[PDB]
Amino acid sequence: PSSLSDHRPVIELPHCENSEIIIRLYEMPYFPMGFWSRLINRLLEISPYMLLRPNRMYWRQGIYLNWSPEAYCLVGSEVLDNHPESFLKITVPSCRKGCILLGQVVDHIDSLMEEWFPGLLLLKKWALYSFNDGEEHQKILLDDLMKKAEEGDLLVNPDQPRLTIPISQIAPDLILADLPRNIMLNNDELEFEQAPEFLLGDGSFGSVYRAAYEGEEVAVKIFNKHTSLRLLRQELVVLCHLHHPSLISLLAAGIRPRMLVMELA
Amino acid sequence: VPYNRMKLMIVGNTGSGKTTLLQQLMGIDVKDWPILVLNVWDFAGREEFYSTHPRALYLAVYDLSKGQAEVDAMKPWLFNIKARASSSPVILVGTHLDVSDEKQRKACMSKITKELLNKRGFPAIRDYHFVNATEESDALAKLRKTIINESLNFKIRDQLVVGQLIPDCYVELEKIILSERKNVPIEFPVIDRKRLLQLVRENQLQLDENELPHAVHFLNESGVLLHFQALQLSDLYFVEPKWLCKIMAQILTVGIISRRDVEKFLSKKRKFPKNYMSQYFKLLEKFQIALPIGEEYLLVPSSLSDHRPVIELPHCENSEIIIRLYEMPYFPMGFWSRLINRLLEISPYMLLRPNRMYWRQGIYLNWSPEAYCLVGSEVLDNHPESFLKITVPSCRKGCILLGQVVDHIDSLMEEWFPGLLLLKKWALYSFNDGEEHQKILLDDLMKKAEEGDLLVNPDQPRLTIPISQIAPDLILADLPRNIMLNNDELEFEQAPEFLLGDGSFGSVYRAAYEGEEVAVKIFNKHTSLRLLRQELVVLCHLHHPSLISLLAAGIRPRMLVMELASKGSLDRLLQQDKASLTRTLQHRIALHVADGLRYLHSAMIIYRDLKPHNVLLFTLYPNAAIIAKIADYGPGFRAPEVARGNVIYNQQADVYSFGLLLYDILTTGGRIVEGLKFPNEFDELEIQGKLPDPVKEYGCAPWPMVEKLIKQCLKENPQERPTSAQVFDILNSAELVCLTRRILLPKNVIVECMVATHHASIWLGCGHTDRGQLSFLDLNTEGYTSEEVADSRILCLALVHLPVEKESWIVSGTQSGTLLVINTEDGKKRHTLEKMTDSVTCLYCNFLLVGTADGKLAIFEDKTVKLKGAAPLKILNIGNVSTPLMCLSESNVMWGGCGTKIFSFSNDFTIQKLIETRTSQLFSYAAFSDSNIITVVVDTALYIAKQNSPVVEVWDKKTEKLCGLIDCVHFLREVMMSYSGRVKTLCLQKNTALWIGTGGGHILLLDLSTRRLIRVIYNFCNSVRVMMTAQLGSLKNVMLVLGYNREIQSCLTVWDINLPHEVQNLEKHIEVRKELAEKMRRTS
């Protein structure tokens, strides 16, 4: 109900320690009233089962949702002392179900950034993290995190190498661990040469080649430095629940190469 | 102080004129009469109080113009008076003399000189008068003088017997309370605030355990307030007499009435809490105002029609029915309402509901033409004595009904109308249908029952009757088939060598029955039959595995054949064979006793006698279905509460007694039992409740859980003590059995690592401070010390044992990367080995393996480490600056964790395989898979726990493949942010038990052969830090679990390594006996 105030109820949560949760921040000074009405309309679509209608508590500029002690998802606006630039904050527990809830939410937020703010892409994406429970969190610009995601290593403290953090915890929606089990790319089965002899076609995202995934010729979409990672999962969203004999099915994704594997015949 | 107040009880029948008598002299109208202040209670109407809740003088008032008939009517009143206060004075006053000819006066005069003044059974009427009218009279002047002088004489009589006079001195504080209770203004005068009122008046009679009970006792006897002591509205609900009497009397007058309609009226009359209303109804029962019929109805005995409804019984010929008569001089007041309450529960099927009818003076139950029952009053001409008649049809069900009826009648009289036990019992019979019945006393039939003969007509031998038809309750024909005595099985001699014991009931002999050892109770000329049947009633309907059952009864020689214990009583075992008394046996005994108590308490039976002398053992074999039983269900070992001799027994008394039994079991020496030999200290000790620490005082091996159970059980306050149901639940625990020790560490001490000495003490690290501090725990004395030994914080400890060189050293790896090596036999021998290039993350040792934070593995030669500054044999680079080594396991090939890879080593320290486990992310969740390995357990598969994972990975070392996942969250998800589900440590036992510690205070026991949850051990502490497997100095294997208990508290818990087995075995044990309980109860 849009008639509600921006009240934020004192709800005791599970997963109170820093390592118990995932925190994603979206910075922008102001999100023109109506933004959160559109946001909640798209937030009231979240359901990890699709890959239950819990005691959600709408906060006008965000929502509680609740889900379960095991997996929950809080989304809403925030502001800090001496930090007038407002921001969105997402809190899910550090687990796959939380990752799923997060992944669906961040896609809804970005689709809103495309919808409510066409062409704006402000909207700074930060991974909030800590090397020790009870300590102060630090922020990673996801652009730099993606530079490190390419490496596939942990966040390594250069001054104290003894402190390292899994990138997948830092940003669960960066590495596709929340996919339906049947489409996680088996890197030991994707016999993809990437040579011109395998070229089938192309597109704005990059190029289409062929590969012997699990011994079968499949089509492969290489997101060749044309907004990779992002477009890849957005396509996966379209592919999810897309089931018809006349259509090209998904034969596993592949976030590490940014190469979607599709039906070829 | 010299209390000068006395009660005046005025009794008589309605219309006597007794109130106006009182008026001139000066349910129940209560007023003071200062003369000496009398508390006058005028029983105006039929106030059952004289029987429902009976320093007083009785004034018996009757109408002389009615005559001798009225005199006889007063016999029940006199009986009742004698029955509760035979020593109290009675003044008999005839009224209406001004309308009664002296003919009646002298007729009644002679009547009382012949039948009351000189007749036993009545409370020796002290004096008497006749009064013309309540206008005034010389007779009344004399009566006043008589009342005064006689009440003085009475108190003199009390001084002669009781020791108290009309100025007897009572504690002044009780007198004060009387005044405090006088001053009470409450809308619904029910008092609980009395505790506060005690505190208002300073605090007098401060002995709540003794003086308080005496004050209350006094307050009822003195006529001040009302306790109602098994009601819920009893102890904490003191009620104004005026309301109790008024409201209940009114409701009677406001005959079957539904409960609900009564509730409706009551809720408008006086808005009582529904809780109080449930008690209200219970009070109506206890005060004989109304009896429960169905759960929705009340009988309301008073006012029931007194015109016995026309009932035509089936069966007419003499031989078709059985008749029993009870001759009485008069029925006691309330006799019938009490009798009815008992008879309503009769049923020939307890081993469709009956068409019940009520006469006030009788009950008719129908059921079926096959079996029905009529009980009611009948009177014959020329036979002043009133009497009961019981009629049942002559068949087995009819017999069963008869047995129940006569058992209730005799029990009624024993409890409520003793003195009669008069009650001439007659049986009716005839030798030919169509003729008249003949009477015979049951005593004579018992004489014939002993002969076993037919009743034979002394004039004509051709006419005989099979005794059973006349009296099927003299011969035990109403027994369950299961307990009829088979005379071809029972084999006994009654010879001296078989005598097991005796008592007021007769004697007990050892015998054989169906090839088994049994005990035979013989009622050898001790008011038998009645005692026999009482025991039969109690024994039947109690069918629990922990009780001694009945193995057939037989009237022919009047016997009860019961189970004989094989190993004898506990007391003997305690003093004769401690070797049998193992920890396992002891626990099982405690369970079996607790069950018996739970059962008997649910059966509303207070045992009142739990001592070692009453516990019987049927086999010392620890793993048996039934081991201990409680004898004879239905000294200096008393609860301090009941030890006062001024309270009533209840379940809490038994619980306290149980606790003492448990204490006695704990100390197998029976040390407090040995204390009995000096009873002057023993009985008082228990009264004091100041028992010594069973461990420290007697040298008894620790047994926590039980130790606190005893403390919880033996509390001074009855309301604080645990219920017997709860006691059992506590005893029903594998944790109870297997927890052996618990040592708390000093406040604000944090231990991050442990090394037990395999030979009885533990070396402890210390992560509380930021300084290399080494602590030490002595398990033999629970001693504790600590000293700073290094600069940076100690991370890992390891024991170097050189039995060849006869020495051993503690290797302390720390944050600085140094290795401090200290001789266990000499604290002065401290030295440092070659410093590592990074901190030490783990140690293992033969070669001393040092795993450092930079992924480097140093290997030191076995003895070489003795030298200061010694270098390692060789050094390997496994990981890197960001991938530290964290685990060296071995169960002679090494396995271990390095970042996210699993390595393995040969005896030449060469790498035999680097298994990258990152690929497990295809299953589970990538942030769990991608995390540093904490520990590696090596069995027939590898068990991997990673940092902050909730999932344990199972790997096939033979093919290097993921073979399964263990979801710890799932297991605790099944259990109803302490539930983090984070895996802390893994220990593995070669009997398939897998021990998994976690973030919260839980330990999971899994079955390696099936990957299944055996049990969740929990509410251990705040968080589990480390777990070790270690052999004690007794060679017993235990788990050493060190945890946090945030108030930074930490502690060491020692568990019996066989916990997994105890969990399963106990569960089985409990279930088997559960089934047996149902088996027994169902047979009946």
Place this chain on the structure above:
Amino acid sequence: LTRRILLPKNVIVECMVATHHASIWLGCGHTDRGQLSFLDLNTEGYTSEEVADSRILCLALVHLPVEKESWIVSGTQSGTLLVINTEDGKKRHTLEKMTDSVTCLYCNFLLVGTADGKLAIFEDKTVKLKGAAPLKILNIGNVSTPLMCLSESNVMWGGCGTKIFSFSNDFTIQKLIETRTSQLFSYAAFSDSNIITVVVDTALYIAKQNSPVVEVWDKKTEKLCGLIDCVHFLREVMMSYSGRVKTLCLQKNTALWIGTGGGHILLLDLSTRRLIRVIYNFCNSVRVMMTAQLGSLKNVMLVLGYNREIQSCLTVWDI
């Protein structure tokens, strides 16, 4: 045949014997003196003549085809035995008076059961003598324990008090079963009772006085084989029906007829112990039942009872 034979109003019968060759002798229970009545089944005729001072307790037929004569022995309350020739009612003989009253008779030789538990045995042709002494006398019970059931079905089963006897060819007690041990089953008031009727085939069927059940005993091991619950069967039927057993008759095809004290007669199959059929409301109270053949040799059941105005009724029931 089911012939409903009615006798004169207030006629009461205490004993019955039929000539197995078509007529029945009946004892006049309604009188105060031994009167002997006689029913002619061929013409439905009925008469009576005085035979004794005391009443008749039991009648029996003595037949000597070698002598071409037959007699009715009258066992009376007096203990005397009057022998009455049926070919000549005036030709009467006398057997030695018993020590007590005669409860039962069975006739080669005549067995005489008495109230004091004795069994006199009179040699067949002593029936022609007056003041004749018995062949042999057995001491079975006593004054408190009467002998009452003589059931040959070639040895004699004896019902005396609570014990079952079996007598040899020379009157030796072959077997003795005290049935008081049956109290473990049933109910003591029934178990402990005088035995009235004993029926024997493969097992013994014991009807005790005032019992609603029949005991079944194993003649081969002397053990209780089972119980027949008559009142149960009447319970199955949808103070007139007390269920007390009055008489047991048994045909070789296991047809056990149980006459009760009411108007019902229970026919039961002893090969399965299963109720076959109840005769409903035969009379108000069945007294005795006898298996016999008519003049046509038709096998009928002589069901004698009362329709209480005592209306004695004999139905010549169709077997």
